[PDB]
Amino acid sequence: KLDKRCSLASWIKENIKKKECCFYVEDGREGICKCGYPKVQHCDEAIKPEDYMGEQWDKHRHVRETPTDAFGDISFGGLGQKTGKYVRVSSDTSCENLYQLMTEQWKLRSPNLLISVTGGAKNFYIKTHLKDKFRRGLIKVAQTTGAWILTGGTHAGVMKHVGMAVRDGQIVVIGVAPWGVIHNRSTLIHPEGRFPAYYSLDEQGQGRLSCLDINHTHFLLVDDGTQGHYGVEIELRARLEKLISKLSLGNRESGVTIPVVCVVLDGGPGTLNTIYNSMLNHTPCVVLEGSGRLADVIAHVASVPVSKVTMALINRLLKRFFMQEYKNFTELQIIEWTKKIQDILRMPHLLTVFRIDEDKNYDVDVAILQALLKASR
Ligand SMILES: [Zn+2]
């Protein structure tokens, strides 16, 4: 067919997979599989398949991929709100299938820059001065460069802050979220897709689950066959950045690639690993001083002479900026995060701190450009 919605539906149903558990095995609680889904939500083939008798459940051997059942346009029911786009995608979706989906089905215009935003997953408050600087800077760089903005895509934490900044052009804001923790996702499921799905945001009732962010434009809902686990989407989100990073769409096919910049607000020790890996991939990182938690820990050690970044100083900073969480940190963790922080500091050409100075008065766009220039050299 020639309809834009039906050619997309056909391509997605033919090429994109979901993952489903094929081996129901309980994990200390009756009626819930190790994959996290109830028994009644399993296919009958998952019940005592003779292929897997006596085996320990294993997410890399006992989940299988089948055509995906959740895709199309998503409406958050606002007034005069343009629908977004979404697809439930297997965690093992190939880079080529992700590229084709994004550029030939979603019709995304290729960008001159990828802005990958990371950091705190739980809601945090940002002071107004810094919030405005982040918004203006983010919008100014994305408009001038045609940039894609990439986040975790759910309605909380730094993801929420990105969505609110972009709230208002056609700014592309891609959310890469774990399908297994999306509250109210039942309305997105249909074999033929939904045009649109009517997604409701009952933040009352998610429990420990998350809602999709209403101000993102595109959603990859990453599915490894499990539910209840956060972190499912981390590997694909890195693969996606690396994908665009290699896209080789810089001018012509000589030797120029799409630059990536990572912007960090707030953040927990999970963000620490995400930052370190990005830098190892030569992605410059911009931390916003004053945005709390990990970003403030890093902002501080970035200011002092390097020989003064001691274990005691970093411990001091963890107590100061992780007020609710520090009591939960183990000695082994503090050791690990401390050396990762010092390793991060060994790559100063890839680390930039945005700090407010009202006698200079710059938005974060300047710090993003300085990041790109310092990395490029
Ligand atoms: Zn299962």
Labels describing this entry:
binds zinc ion, two-stranded antiparallel sheet, ten-stranded mixed sheet, 377 residues, signaling protein, alpha/beta, monomer, 12 strands
Protein topology:
Layout: H1 4-15, E1 17-21, E2 63-67, E3 71-75, E4 84-90, H2 95-105, E5 114-119, H3 128-145, E6 148-151, H4 157-166, E7 172-178, E8 194-198, E9 218-223, H5 234-245, E10 260-265, H6 269-280, E11 285-288, H7 293-303, H8 311-321, H9 331-345, E12 351-354, H10 364-376
Parallel strand pairs: 3-8, 4-9, 5-6, 5-10, 6-7, 7-9, 10-11, 11-12
Antiparallel strand pairs: 1-2, 3-4
Helix pairs in contact: 3-4, 3-10, 6-9, 7-8
The chain binds zinc ion (ZN).
Subcellular location: Cell membrane
Subunit structure: Homotetramer.
Organism: Danio rerio (Zebrafish)
| Gross morphology | globular
Each distinct ligand: zinc ion
**Whole-Å distance between the termini?**
50 Å
**Main beta sheet, described?**
10 strands, mixed
Count every beta strand, where a strand is a DSSP E run of 2 or more residues. Answer: 12
Q: Briefly note the structural class of the backbone.
A: alpha/beta
Rg estimate, integer Å: 22 Å
Helix-strand sequence: HEEEEHEHEHEEEHEHEHHHEH
User: How large a portion of the residues is in β-strands, by DSSP E?
Assistant: 15-25%
- Major β-sheet strand ordering: 8-3-4-9-7-6-5-10-11-12
PDB class: signaling protein
Keywords: trpm2, signaling protein
Assembly: monomeric
Entry title: Crystal Structure of a TRPM2 Domain
